[PDB]
Symmetry: C2
Subunit: 150 residues, 2 copies
């Protein structure tokens, strides 16, 4: 379906994912933890679609993602499971779970939002930063926003 | 599938729709027109699910002097209405968040959704909420005061 033919195509997807990261960050800051989280899980599946379009990033362990959030194992497990899909659903859409009404603001925690954005940014960084001059420019904003969330 | 059995359920949904409106406005007001629009279209779909839930369906009834009529004009209302009837609003929603290869040229949200489109869809979504759900519960009127303000700001 989706295959990138050019270094310009990769820079377009880089740029777009920078927008989602700025929007996920903007939402987290304004305490919209559930909507932020929805955009955070989108980035991780969009980063994965881009990497595959050119033809998961193994935790550093001791690296800035550990020192900032342990909880990594959790997100990686939910990601492998297919559980991150249902967490994303529940982070934007209200739902009758069996016969109680469930709502985004009471399914996503401030720290869950913080962790998936920090994880999304690493997803993008480990996957795409390094393959163009442009990625390096972008990574310094990605870095500034990452550091600010710690 | 989705039904609501109490005014507590309705108000919780109403509150959630208030969150999405604030979020679409937050994004728009930054300059993330595309992500905004994804939320604005979601709001229109989740107002319908909710209205129907208590019984793109519930489109606002347009009146000649109406605040929306005033903020975006007759042409545009008609356009959004047609996009909702034919399901163009779903493709617009997909294109406002997800990169795509169409014909064989990479498409990105920033190049599909204009400021003008983003503004009109949030105003429109806000008027969906208001027409469909405000009046049902005493709490809805409280939330309408917030949504009314966001509406006033966006239309000037
Ligand atoms: Br470059
Ligand atoms: Br009352
Ligand atoms: Na009404």
């Amino acid at each position: 379906k989706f295959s990138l033919k050019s270094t310009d195509d990769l820079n377009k997807c880089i740029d777009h994912i920078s927008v989602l990261i700025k929007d996920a960050y903007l939402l987290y800051t304004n305490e919209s933890f559930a909507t932020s989280t929805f955009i955070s899980i989108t980035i991780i599946e969009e980063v994965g679609k881009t990497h595959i379009g050119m033809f998961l990033p193994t935790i550093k362990m001791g690296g800035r993602l550990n020192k900032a959030i342990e909880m990594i194992d959790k997100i990686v497990e939910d990601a492998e499971t297919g559980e991150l899909i249902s967490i994303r659903e529940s982070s934007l859409y209200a739902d009758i779970i069996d016969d109680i009404l469930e709502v985004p603001s009471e399914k996503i925690s401030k720290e869950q939002s913080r962790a998936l954005l920090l994880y999304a940014i690493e997803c993008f960084d480990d996957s795409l930063v390094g393959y163009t001059h442009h990625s390096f420019e972008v990574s310094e904003t990605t870095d500034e926003l990452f550091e600010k969330l710690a």
